[PDB]
Ligand binder design. Structure first.
Ligand SMILES: CC(=O)N[C@@H]1[C@@H](O)[C@H](O[C@@H]2O[C@H](CO)[C@@H](O)[C@H](O)[C@H]2NC(C)=O)[C@@H](CO)O[C@H]1O
Ligand SMILES: [Ca+2]
Ligand SMILES: [Ca+2]
Ligand SMILES: [Cl-]
Ligand SMILES: [Mg+2]
Length: 527
């Protein structure tokens, strides 16, 4: 049998948990591979919908119905039907802790129309809602209804719809997830098993990938041409452009001195001008990125959406200018009053910014250490922390952090970045990710975001985008640094069929949250 070695997520030890709603504690081979979506939107190719368990869908406006593919079975053998979909969406509406997106804010309810067809009722006008709906995991009703506790259910013997449901081998350091015996698309599948080794950080990953022990990965790799590519003719990669990375500052820091600094727009702009974004790219990412000098975080890949007058107005604040940063600090009134060379707050208080990035994410760790040095050059005191991801994440959810370095989801239009990074509704909820947790709130901004897909008028949507750009830019809510890359390494020793620059069928990454990985694995063939 052919075994495909993949690495979606760092772990110190595997805990057997295949619960699709528990994104913070499950294994990252659950979505897509155990639970196939209704539709995969191919985001690299204009969000072209690729139909899987649903064969079609139809909007109307307010209304949308999905037709279900008939003759699909679960891995046990039972039939896949429309009440599985209905069952699944009810669950999350009642337990909004399993809402990892904000889906409950859009869908008011769901109704079975027949054995292969389901209607979805909306809260507001949203031409983008089929994309949102595809995010919700569909689980089997003949199992999860018999389940007493979904919020804690670990689901160690999963019944799934996807290509790999069979747990063949499981240890704290290795598991192997094999083909669903009843898989509906089996004629299309040429890989027998997914092989998933425990790897805790980038250092551990590097030794393994360079030794040719991996097949499909998406980790940071330093000096990739000399370390990884040069080791074997079988060692390849392809890094299509990805999303924004930024320093995010906590507007609700509990320390008086740090709050005084972080909530000050002159201070955020001077922080931003202290940074040398191209040096960060050159050193921390070995060239693997593009400068992002948009105060709104938009990035150069959306030139067509950008209001260039706005971009030009605030670009000086997002360009390397150490002398300008020192002048702005002086003008704002951050004066050093205790002879240590670091500026103090207007109220006379000293402070040091603690900047966090996740443990093991060494490209971001190095970025933070570079920024620390650069900030010290303009008299801003900071130092780095590299906490375990869950600690890092919890600090942002609870608002106990000072500054955090983070990437963001990247979509075919600016909404994916702008909504996830700035919609204040995403700052409360216990299924919420880190991305909006600066705790800046602007009601006009939320309104513009909530209207982005409200009309089917392209010109108006463009005007809404320009308004969102204006607001974020003038308030320098975050400090955008660069636009990153979809890191992706593949090995042709054991498999062929890979997406790459000459075969760019979609986002090639193995991360959970990249639905296209289902379509990718269906293209792979054993050598
Ligand atoms: C938007 C987002 O949170 N994406 C996450 C990925 O960044 C992350 O992959 C990790 O990215 C780090 C930063 O570039 C790399 O240092 C690291 O090697 C890489 N890890 C792996 C295993 O690919 C993944 C996994 O943590 O989660 C995504 O959600
Ligand atoms: Ca195939
Ligand atoms: Ca001082
Ligand atoms: Cl290189
Ligand atoms: Mg090991």
């Amino acid at each position: 049998r052919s075994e495909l070695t993949i690495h979606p997520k760092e772990f110190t030890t595997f805990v057997r948990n295949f619960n699709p709603f528990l994104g913070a504690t499950n294994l990252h081979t659950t979505t897509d591979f155990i639970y196939e979506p209704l539709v995969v939107f191919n985001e690299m190719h204009g969000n072209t919908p690729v139909f899987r368990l649903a064969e079609n869908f139809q909007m109307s406006d307010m209304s949308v119905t999905f037709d279900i593919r008939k003759g699909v079975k679960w891995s046990d053998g039972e039939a896949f039907t429309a009440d599985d979909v209905v069952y699944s969406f009810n669950l999350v509406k009642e337990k909004p802790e399993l809402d990892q997106s904000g889906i409950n804010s859009w869908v008011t309810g769901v109704e079975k129309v027949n054995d292969y067809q389901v209607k979805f009722r909306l809260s507001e006008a949203n031409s983008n809602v089929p994309y949102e709906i595809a995010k919700v995991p569909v689980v089997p009703k003949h199992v999860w209804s018999k389940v007493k506790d979904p919020s804690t259910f670990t689901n160690e013997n999963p019944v799934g719809s996807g290509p790999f449901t069979v747990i063949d081998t499981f240890t704290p350091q290795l598991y192997i997830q094999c083909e669903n015996p009843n898989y509906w698309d089996a004629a299309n599948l040429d890989v027998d098993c997914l092989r998933v080794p425990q790897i805790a950080n980038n250092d551990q990953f590097l030794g393994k990938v360079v030794n040719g022990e991996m097949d499909w990965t998406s980790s940071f790799v330093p000096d990739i041409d000399r370390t990884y590519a040069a080791a074997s003719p079988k060692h390849h990669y392809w890094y299509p452009p990805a999303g924004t990375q930024a320093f995010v500052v906590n507007f609700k820091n509990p320390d008086a001195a740090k709050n005084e600094a972080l909530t000050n727009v002159d201070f955020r702009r001077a922080f931003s001008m202290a940074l040398d974004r191209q040096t960060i790219i050159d050193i921390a990412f070995y060239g693997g990125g593009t400068v992002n000098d948009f105060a709104s975080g938009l990035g150069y890949a959306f030139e067509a959406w950008s209001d260039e007058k706005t971009h030009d107005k605030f670009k000086a604040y997002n360009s390397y200018n150490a002398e300008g940063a020192k002048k702005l600090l002086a003008k704002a009134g951050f004066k050093d009053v205790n002879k240590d060379g670091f500026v103090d707050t207007p109220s006379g208080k000293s402070f040091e910014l603690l900047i966090q990035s996740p443990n093991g994410w060494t490209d971001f760790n190095n970025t933070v250490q570079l920024a620390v040095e650069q900030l010290a050059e303009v008299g801003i005191k900071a130092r780095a922390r590299t906490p375990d991801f869950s600690v890092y994440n919890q600090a942002m959810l609870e608002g106990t952090y000072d500054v955090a370095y983070t990437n963001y989801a990247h979509g075919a239009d600016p909404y994916t970045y702008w909504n996830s990074a700035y919609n204040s509704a995403l700052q409360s909820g216990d299924g919420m990710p880190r991305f909006a947790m600066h705790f800046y709130k602007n009601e006009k901004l939320d309104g513009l975001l909530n209207s982005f897909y409200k009309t089917a008028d392209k010109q108006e949507q463009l005007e809404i985008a320009h308004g969102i750009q204006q607001i974020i830019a003038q308030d320098q809510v975050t400090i955008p640094v660069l636009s990153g890359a979809y890191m992706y390494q593949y090995n042709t020793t054991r498999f062929t069929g890979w997406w790459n620059e000459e075969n760019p069928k979609g986002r090639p990454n193995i991360w959970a949250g990249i639905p296209e990985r289902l379509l990718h694995v269906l293209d792979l063939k054993p050598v």
